Short mmCIF file of C-alpha atoms and ligand atoms in Angstrom, two decimals:
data_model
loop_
_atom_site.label_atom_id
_atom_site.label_comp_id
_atom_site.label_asym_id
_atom_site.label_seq_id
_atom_site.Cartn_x
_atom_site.Cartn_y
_atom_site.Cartn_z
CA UNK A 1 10.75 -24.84 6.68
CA UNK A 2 11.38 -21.26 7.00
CA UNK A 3 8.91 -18.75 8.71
CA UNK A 4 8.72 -15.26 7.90
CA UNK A 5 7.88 -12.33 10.18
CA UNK A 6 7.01 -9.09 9.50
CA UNK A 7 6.69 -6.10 12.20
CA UNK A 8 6.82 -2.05 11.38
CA UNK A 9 8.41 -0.08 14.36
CA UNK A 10 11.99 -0.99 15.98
CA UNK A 11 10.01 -1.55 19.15
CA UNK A 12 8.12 -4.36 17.51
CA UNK A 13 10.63 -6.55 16.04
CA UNK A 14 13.73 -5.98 18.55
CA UNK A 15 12.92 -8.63 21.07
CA UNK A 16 12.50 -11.18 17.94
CA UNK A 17 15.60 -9.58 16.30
CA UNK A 18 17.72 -10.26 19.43
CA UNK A 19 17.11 -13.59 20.02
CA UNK A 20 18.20 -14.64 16.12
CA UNK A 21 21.69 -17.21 16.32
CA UNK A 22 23.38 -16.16 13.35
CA UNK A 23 21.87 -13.19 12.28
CA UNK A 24 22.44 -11.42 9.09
CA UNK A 25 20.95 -8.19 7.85
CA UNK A 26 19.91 -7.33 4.64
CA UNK A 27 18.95 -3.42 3.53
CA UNK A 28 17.25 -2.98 0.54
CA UNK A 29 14.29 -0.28 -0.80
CA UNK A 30 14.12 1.04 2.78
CA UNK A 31 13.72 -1.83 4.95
CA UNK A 32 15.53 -4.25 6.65
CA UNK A 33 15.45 -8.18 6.39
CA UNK A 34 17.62 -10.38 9.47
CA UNK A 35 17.87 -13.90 8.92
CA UNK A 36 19.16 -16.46 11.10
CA UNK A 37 17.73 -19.50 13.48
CA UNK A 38 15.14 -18.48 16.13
CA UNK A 39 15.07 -21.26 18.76
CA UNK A 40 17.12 -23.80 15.57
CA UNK A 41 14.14 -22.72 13.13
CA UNK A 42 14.95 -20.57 10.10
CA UNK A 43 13.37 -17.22 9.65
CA UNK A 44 13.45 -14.00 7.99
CA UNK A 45 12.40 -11.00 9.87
CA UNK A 46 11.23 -7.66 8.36
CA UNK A 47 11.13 -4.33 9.53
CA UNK A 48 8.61 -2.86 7.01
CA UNK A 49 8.10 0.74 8.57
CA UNK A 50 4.65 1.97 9.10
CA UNK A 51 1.45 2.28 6.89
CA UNK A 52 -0.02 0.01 4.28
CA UNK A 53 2.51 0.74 1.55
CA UNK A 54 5.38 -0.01 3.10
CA UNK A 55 4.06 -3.19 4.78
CA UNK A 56 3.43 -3.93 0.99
CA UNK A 57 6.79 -3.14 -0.37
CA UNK A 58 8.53 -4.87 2.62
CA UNK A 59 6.40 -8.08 2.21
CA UNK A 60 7.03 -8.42 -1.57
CA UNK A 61 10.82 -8.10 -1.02
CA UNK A 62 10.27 -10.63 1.41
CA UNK A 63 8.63 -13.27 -0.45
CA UNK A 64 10.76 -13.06 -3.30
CA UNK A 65 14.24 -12.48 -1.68
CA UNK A 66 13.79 -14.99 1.01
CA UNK A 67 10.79 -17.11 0.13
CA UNK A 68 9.26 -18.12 3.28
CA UNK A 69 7.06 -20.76 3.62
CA UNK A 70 4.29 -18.46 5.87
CA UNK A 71 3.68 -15.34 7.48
CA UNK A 72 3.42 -14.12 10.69
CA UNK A 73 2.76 -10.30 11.33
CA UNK A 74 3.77 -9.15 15.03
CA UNK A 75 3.60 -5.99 16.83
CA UNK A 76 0.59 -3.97 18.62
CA UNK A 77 -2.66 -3.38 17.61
CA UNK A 78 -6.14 -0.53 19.00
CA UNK A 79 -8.14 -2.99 20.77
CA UNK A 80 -11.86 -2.48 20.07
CA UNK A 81 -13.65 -5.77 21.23
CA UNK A 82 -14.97 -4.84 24.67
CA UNK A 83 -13.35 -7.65 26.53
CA UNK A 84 -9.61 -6.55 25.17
CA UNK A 85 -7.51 -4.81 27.66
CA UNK A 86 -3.55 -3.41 27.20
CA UNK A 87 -0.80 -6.83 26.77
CA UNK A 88 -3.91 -9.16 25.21
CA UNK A 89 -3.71 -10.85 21.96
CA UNK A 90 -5.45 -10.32 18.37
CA UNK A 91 -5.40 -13.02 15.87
CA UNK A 92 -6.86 -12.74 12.71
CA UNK A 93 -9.48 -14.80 10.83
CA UNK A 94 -9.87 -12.19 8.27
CA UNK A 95 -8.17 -8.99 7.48
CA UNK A 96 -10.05 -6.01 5.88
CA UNK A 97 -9.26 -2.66 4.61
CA UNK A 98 -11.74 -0.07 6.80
CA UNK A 99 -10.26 3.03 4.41
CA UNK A 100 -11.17 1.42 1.24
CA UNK A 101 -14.13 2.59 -0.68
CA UNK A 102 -15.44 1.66 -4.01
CA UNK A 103 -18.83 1.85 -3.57
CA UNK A 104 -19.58 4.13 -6.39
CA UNK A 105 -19.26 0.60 -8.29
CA UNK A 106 -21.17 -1.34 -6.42
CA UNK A 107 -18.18 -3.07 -4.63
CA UNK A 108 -18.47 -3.91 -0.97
CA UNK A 109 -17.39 -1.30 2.10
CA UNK A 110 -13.48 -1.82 2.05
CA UNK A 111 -12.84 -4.20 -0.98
CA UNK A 112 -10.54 -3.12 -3.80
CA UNK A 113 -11.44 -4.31 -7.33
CA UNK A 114 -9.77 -7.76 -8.22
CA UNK A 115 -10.09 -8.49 -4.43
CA UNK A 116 -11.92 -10.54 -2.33
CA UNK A 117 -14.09 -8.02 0.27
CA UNK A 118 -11.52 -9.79 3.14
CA UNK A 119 -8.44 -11.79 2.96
CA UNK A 120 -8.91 -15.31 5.15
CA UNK A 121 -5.60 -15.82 7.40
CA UNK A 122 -4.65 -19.52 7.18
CA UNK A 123 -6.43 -22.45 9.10
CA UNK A 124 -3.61 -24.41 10.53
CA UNK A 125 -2.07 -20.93 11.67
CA UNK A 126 -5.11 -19.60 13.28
CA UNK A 127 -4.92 -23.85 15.21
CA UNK A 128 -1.54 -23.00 15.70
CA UNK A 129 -1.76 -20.04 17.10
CA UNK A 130 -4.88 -20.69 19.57
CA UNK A 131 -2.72 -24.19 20.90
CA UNK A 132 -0.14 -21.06 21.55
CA UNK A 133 -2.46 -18.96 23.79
CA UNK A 134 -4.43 -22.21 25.42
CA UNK A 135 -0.52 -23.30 26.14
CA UNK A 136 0.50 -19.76 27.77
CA UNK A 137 -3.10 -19.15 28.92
CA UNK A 138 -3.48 -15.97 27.45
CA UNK A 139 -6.17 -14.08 26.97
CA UNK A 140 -7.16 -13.71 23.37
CA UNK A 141 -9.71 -13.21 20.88
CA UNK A 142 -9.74 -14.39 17.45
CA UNK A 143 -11.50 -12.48 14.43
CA UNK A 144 -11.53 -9.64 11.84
CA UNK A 145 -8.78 -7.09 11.92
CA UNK A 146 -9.23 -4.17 10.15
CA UNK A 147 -6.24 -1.75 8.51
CA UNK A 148 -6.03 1.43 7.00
CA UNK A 149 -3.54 4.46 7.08
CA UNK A 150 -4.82 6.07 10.11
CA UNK A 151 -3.39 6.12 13.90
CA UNK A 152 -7.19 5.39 15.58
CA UNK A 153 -7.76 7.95 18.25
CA UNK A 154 -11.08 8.14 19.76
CA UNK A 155 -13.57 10.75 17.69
CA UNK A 156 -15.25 10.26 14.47
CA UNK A 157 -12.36 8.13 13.69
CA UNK A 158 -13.37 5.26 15.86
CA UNK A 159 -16.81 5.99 15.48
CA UNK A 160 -16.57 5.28 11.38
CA UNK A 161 -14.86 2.15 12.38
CA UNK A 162 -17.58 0.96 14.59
CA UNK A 163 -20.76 1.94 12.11
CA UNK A 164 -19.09 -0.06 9.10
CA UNK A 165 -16.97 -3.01 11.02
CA UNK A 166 -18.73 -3.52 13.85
CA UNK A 167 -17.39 -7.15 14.48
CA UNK A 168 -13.99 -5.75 14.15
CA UNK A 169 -11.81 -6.76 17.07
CA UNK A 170 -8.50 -4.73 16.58
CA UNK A 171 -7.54 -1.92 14.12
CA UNK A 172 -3.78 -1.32 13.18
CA UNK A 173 -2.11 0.01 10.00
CA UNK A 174 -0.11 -2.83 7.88
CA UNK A 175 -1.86 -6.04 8.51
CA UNK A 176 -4.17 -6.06 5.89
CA UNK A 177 -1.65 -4.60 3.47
CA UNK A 178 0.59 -8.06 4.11
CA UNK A 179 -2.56 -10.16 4.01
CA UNK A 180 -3.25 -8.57 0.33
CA UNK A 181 0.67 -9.74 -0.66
CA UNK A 182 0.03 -13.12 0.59
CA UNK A 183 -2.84 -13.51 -1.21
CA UNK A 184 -1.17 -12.42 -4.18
CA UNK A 185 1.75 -14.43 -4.10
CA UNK A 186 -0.61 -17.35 -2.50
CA UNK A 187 1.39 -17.65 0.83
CA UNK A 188 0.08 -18.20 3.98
CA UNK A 189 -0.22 -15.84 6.72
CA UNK A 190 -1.65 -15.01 10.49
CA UNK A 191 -1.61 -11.69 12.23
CA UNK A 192 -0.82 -12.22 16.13
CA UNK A 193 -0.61 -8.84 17.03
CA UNK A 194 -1.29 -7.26 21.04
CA UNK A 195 -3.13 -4.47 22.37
CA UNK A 196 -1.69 -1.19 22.62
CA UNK A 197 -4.49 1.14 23.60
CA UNK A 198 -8.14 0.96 22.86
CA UNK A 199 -8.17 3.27 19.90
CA UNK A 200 -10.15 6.09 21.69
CA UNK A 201 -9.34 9.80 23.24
CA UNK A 202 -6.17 8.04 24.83
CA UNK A 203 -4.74 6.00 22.69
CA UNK A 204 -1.66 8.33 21.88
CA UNK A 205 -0.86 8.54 25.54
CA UNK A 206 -1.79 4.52 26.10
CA UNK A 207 0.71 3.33 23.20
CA UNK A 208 3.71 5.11 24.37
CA UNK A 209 2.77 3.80 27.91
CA UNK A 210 2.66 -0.09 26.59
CA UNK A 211 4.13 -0.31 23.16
CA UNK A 212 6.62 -2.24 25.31
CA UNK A 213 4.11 -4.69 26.79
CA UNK A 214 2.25 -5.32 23.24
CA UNK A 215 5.79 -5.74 21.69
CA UNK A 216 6.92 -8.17 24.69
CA UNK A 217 3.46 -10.58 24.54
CA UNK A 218 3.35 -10.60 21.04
CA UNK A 219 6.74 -11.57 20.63
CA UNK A 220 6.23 -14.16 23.16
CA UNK A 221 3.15 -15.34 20.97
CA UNK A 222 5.69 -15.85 17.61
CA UNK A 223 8.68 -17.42 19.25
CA UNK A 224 5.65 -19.77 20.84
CA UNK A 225 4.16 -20.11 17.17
CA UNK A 226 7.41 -20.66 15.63
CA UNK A 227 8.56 -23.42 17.73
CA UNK A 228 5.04 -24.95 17.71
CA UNK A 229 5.09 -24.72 13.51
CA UNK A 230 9.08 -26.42 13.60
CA UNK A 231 7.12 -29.20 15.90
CA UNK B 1 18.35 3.59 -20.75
CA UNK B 2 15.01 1.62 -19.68
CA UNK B 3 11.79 3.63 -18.67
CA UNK B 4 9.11 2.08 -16.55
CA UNK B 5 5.92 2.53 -17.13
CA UNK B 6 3.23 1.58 -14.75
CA UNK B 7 -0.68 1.92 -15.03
CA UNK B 8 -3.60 0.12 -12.58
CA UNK B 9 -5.72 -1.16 -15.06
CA UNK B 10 -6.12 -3.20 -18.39
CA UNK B 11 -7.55 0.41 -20.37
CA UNK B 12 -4.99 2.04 -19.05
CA UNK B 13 -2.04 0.17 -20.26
CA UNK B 14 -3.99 -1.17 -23.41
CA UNK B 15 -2.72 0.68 -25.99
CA UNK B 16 1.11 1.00 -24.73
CA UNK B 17 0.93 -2.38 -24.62
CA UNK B 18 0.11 -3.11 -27.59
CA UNK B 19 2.72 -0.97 -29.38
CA UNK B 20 5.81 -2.61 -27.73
CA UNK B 21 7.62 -4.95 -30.09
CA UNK B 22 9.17 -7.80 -29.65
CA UNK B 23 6.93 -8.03 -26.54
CA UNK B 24 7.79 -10.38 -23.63
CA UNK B 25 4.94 -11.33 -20.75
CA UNK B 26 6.31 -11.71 -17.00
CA UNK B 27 3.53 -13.14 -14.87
CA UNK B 28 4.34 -12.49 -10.84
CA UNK B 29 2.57 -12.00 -7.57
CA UNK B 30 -0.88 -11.05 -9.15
CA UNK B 31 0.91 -8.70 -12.01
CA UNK B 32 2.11 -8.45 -15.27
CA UNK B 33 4.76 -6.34 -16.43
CA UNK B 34 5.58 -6.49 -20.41
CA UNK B 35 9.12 -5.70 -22.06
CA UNK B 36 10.28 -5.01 -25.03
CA UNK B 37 10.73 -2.05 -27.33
CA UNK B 38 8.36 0.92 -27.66
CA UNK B 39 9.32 2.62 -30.69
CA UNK B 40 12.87 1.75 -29.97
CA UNK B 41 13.12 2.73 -26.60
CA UNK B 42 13.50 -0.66 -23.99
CA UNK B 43 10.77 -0.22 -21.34
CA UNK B 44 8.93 -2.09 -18.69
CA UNK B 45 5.34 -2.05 -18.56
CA UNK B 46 3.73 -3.45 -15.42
CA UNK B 47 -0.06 -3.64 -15.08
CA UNK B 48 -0.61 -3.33 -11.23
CA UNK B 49 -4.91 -3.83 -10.73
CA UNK B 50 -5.79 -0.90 -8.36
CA UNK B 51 -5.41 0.82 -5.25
CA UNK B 52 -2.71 1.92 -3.00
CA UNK B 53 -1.05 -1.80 -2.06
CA UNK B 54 -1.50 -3.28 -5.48
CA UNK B 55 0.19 -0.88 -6.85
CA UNK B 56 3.24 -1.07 -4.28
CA UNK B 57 3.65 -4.28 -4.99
CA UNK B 58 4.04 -4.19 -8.31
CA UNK B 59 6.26 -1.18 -8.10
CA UNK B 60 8.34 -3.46 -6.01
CA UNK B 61 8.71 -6.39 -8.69
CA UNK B 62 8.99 -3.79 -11.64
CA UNK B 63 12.13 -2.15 -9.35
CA UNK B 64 13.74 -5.06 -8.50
CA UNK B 65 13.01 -7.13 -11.56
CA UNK B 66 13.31 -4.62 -14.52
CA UNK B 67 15.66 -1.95 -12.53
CA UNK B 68 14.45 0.56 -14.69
CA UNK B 69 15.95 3.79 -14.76
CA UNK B 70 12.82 6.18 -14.26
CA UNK B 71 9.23 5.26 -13.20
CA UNK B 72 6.20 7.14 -15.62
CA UNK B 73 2.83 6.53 -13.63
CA UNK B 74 0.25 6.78 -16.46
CA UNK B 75 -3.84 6.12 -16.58
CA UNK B 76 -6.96 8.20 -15.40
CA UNK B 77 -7.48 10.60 -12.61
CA UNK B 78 -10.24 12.18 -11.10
CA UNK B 79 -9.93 16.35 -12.01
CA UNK B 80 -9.83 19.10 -9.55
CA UNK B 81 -8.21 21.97 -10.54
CA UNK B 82 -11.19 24.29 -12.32
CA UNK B 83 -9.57 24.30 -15.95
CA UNK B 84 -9.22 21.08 -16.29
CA UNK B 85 -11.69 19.03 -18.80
CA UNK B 86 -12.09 15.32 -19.27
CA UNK B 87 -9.04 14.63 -21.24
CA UNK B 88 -6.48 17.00 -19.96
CA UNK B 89 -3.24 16.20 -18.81
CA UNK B 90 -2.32 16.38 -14.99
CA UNK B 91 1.85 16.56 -13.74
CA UNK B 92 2.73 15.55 -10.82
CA UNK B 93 5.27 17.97 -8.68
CA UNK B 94 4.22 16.23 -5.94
CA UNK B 95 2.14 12.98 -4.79
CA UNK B 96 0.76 13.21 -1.09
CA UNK B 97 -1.91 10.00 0.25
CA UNK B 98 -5.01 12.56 1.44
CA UNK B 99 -6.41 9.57 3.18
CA UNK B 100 -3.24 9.20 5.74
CA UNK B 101 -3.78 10.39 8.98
CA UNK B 102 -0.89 10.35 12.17
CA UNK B 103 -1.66 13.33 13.18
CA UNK B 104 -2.06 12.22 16.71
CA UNK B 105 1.41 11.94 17.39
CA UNK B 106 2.07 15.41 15.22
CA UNK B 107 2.89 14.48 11.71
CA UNK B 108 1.22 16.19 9.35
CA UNK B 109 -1.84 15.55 7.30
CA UNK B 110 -1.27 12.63 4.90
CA UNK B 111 2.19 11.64 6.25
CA UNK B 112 3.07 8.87 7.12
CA UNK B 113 6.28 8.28 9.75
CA UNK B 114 9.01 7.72 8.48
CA UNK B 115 8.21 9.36 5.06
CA UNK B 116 8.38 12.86 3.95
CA UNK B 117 4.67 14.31 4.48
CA UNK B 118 4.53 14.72 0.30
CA UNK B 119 6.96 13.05 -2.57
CA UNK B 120 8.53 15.27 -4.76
CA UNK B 121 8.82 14.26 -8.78
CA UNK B 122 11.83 14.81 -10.67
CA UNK B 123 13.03 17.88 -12.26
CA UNK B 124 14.16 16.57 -15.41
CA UNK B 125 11.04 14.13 -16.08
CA UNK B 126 8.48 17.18 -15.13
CA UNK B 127 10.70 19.40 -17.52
CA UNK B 128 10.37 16.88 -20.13
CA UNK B 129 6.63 16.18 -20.06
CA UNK B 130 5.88 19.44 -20.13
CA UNK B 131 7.50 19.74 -22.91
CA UNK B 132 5.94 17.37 -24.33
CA UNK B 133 2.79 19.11 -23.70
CA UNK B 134 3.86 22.14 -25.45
CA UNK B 135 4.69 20.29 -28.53
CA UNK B 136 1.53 18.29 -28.73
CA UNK B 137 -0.36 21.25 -27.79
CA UNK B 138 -2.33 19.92 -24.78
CA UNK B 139 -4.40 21.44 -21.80
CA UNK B 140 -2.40 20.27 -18.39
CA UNK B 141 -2.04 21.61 -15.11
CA UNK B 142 1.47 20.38 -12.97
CA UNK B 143 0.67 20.06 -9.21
CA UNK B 144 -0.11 18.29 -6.30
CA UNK B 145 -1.78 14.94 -7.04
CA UNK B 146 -3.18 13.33 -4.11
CA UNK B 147 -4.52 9.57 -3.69
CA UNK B 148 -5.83 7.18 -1.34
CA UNK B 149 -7.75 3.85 -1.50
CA UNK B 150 -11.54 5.18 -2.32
CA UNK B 151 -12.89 6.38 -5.79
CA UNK B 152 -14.30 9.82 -5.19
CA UNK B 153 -17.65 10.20 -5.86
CA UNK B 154 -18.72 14.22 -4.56
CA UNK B 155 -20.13 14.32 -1.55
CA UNK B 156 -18.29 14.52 2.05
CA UNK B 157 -15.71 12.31 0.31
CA UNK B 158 -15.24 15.06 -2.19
CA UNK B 159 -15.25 17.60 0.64
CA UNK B 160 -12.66 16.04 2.54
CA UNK B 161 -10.08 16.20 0.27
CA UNK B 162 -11.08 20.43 -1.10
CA UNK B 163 -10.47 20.70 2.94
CA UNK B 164 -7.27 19.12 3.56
CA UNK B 165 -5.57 19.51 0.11
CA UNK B 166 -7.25 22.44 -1.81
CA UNK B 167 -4.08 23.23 -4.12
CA UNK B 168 -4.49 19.31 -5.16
CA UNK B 169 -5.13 18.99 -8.95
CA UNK B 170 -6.21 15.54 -8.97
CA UNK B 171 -7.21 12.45 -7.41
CA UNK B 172 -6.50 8.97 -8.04
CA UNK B 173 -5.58 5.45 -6.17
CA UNK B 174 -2.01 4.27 -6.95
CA UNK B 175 0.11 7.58 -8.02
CA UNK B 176 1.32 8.44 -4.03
CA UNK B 177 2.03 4.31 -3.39
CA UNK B 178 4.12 4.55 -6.76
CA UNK B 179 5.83 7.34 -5.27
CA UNK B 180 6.62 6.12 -2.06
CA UNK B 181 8.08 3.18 -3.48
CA UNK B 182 10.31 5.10 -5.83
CA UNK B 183 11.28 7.69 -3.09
CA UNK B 184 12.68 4.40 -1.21
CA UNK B 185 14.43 3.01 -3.90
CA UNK B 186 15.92 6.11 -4.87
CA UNK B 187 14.35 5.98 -8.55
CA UNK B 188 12.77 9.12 -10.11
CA UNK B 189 9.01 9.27 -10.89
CA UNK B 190 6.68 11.16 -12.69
CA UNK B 191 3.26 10.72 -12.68
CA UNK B 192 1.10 11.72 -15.94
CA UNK B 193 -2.15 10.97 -16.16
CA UNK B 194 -5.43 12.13 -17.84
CA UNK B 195 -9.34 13.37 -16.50
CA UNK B 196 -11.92 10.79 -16.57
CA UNK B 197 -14.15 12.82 -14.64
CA UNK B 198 -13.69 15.52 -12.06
CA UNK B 199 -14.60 13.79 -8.58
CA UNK B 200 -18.49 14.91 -8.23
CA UNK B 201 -21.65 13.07 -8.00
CA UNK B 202 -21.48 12.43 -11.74
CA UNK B 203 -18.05 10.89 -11.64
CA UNK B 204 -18.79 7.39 -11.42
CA UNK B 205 -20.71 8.12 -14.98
CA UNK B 206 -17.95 10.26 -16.73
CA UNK B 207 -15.41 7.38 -15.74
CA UNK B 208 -17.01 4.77 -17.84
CA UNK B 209 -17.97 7.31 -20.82
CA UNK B 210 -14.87 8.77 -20.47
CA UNK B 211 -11.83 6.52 -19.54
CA UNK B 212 -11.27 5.46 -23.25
CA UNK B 213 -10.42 9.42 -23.64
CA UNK B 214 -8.47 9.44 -20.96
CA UNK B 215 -6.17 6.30 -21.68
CA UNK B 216 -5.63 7.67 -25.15
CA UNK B 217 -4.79 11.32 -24.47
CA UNK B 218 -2.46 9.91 -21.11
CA UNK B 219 -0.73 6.94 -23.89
CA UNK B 220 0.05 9.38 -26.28
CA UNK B 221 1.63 11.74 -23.57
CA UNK B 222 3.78 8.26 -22.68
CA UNK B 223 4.91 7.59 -25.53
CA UNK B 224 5.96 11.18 -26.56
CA UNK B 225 7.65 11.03 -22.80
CA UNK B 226 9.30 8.18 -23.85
CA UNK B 227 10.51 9.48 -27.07
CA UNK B 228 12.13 12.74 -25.72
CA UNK B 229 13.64 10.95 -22.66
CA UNK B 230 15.49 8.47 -25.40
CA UNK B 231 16.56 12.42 -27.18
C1 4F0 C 301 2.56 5.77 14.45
S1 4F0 C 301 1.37 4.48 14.36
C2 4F0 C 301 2.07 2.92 13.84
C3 4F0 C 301 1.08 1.77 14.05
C4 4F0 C 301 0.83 1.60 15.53
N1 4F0 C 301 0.77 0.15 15.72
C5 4F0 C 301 -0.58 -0.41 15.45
C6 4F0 C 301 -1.58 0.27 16.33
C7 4F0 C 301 -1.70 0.25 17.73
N2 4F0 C 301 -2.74 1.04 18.15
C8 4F0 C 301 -3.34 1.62 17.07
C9 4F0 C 301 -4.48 2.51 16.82
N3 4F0 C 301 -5.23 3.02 17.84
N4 4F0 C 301 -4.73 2.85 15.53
C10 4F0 C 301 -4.00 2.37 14.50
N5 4F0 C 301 -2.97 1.53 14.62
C11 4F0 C 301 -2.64 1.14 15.88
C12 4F0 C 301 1.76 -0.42 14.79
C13 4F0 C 301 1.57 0.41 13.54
O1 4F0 C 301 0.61 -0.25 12.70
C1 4F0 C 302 -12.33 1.40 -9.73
S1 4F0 C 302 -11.36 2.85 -9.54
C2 4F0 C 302 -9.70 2.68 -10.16
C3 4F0 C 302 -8.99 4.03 -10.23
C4 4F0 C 302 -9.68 4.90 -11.25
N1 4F0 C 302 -8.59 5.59 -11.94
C5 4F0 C 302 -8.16 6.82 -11.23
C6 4F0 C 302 -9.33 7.74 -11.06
C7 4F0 C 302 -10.09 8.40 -12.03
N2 4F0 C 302 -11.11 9.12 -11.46
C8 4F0 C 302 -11.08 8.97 -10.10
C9 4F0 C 302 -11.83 9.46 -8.94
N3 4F0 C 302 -12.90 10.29 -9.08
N4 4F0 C 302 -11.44 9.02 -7.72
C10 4F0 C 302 -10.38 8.19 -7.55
N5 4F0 C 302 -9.62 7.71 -8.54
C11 4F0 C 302 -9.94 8.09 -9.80
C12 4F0 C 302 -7.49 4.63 -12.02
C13 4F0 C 302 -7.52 3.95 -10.67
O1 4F0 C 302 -6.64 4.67 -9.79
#
């Protein structure tokens, strides 16, 4: 069993990155790839960089250079469900684009043609994971994240958000991206990502503040998830 | 030398298609990408489907698989520069995502971190189309083409983009992704494409009249491309 991760900034996939035995590094179209044993389980790490396409690019090198057996994105996430604060986790049930829109066609708010409107995350991941936050009695909530190429920060922005997602729960900017290559390549995948900020006026000044915590819980969550998925 | 050729949907790579000989069908992660000879020049066709992460994707397996030398984005776009009429040719210089938006941490409209805020087109390949626009005697405009993940459709969507980008030509969904993914890779691109419609209230009309036009005035421009780039 092998168990790719994916994360965009340094800060998110350092911790992970550290704590690989063996590590090797592999550079290729822009990204980097370390493999290596996590706690004696194999996995492949990416560092994608930030923003739906090269999420996309990183993921597709990832599945075909080191064909993982699932997916787990990391990193931090704009918190919008009202019971959310900074260091909590996200995990998906669904991921959906909120800056897609094809409605002139009569497609749904945020569905690309030849997609479903959302992409499901896995079942026995989403277990996984919520035996993961029960275990380290976290506080979590599970549910739709949404994506799109846009750092949320308070304004119209968020407002948009709100009006056409309303049961969204997080917002970042790669998650659905991966969840759209894994249903491609039918692999699949979880998002376990933590809060940031709370994607209003503040969130620029909240995410420098606790990138660091988001990166550290989250990171806690996938070497948790990883060991739980080895058994 | 081996040119790929990418367009998002089945009208669009149609007729290009169907002129390679000795045609072979690779079926991966959702895409297909066609080889062969088009009228003696090797190339690699890849159908992507639409939008921004499709289209990344498949620009990913095309790279990888195919290493082609040069990338040719072909298909429809929406028109925005005043001369243009359905059918004309539209040159990239540059491809810039008018839907990105980091500018809470200072980046500039449509960047993205990490990436330049626009992706230049090469030299030689925008020399050599418009060449090929000379010879064939066709209406085109070379300039910014802008994209994003929403079919434009007048309106504030419309408005948006006259606001942020007004020396955009065009607008379409997969040229910038395409882009990106070459400027990684370190592979020259050139996107030309043909008006379906220019971006109004009427455009979701005009696209269906009009892509046939579109696919045929942008495949002939291909395969002239092609043709000159071989010498
Ligand atoms: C320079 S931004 C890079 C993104 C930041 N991280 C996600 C995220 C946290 N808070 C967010 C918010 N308010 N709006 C959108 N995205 C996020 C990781 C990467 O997706
Ligand atoms: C179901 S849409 C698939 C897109 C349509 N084509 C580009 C295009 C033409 N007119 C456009 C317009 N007004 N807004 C955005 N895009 C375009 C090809 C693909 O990108």
């Amino acid at each position: 069993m092998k168990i790719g991760i994916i994360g965009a900034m340094e800060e998110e996939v350092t911790l992970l990155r550290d704590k690989i035995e063996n590590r090797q590094t592999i550079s290729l179209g822009g990204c980097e790839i370390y493999t290596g044993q996590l706690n004696g389980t194999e996995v492949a790490l990416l560092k994608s960089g930030i923003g739906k396409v090269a999420a996309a690019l990183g993921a597709t090198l990832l599945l075909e250079h080191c064909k993982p057996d699932v997916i787990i994105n990391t990193g931090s996430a704009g918190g919008l469900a009202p019971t959310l604060k900074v260091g909590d986790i996200v995990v998906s049930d669904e991921a959906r684009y909120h800056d897609a829109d094809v409605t002139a066609f009569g497609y749904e708010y945020g569905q690309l043609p030849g997609c479903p409107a959302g992409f499901k995350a896995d079942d026995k991941l989403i277990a996984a994971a919520e035996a993961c936050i029960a275990e380290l009695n976290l506080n979590a909530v599970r549910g739709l994240i949404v994506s799109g190429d846009a750092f949320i920060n308070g304004s119209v922005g968020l407002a948009k958000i709100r009006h056409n997602f309303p049961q969204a729960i997080a917002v970042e900017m790669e998650a659905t991206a991966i969840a759209h290559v894994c249903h491609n390549f039918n692999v699949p995948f979880v998002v376990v990502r933590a809060i940031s900020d709370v994607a209003d006026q503040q969130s620029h000044l909240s995410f420098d503040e606790f990138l660091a915590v988001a990166a550290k819980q989250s990171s806690l969550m996938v070497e948790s998830l990883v060991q739980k998925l080895a058994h």
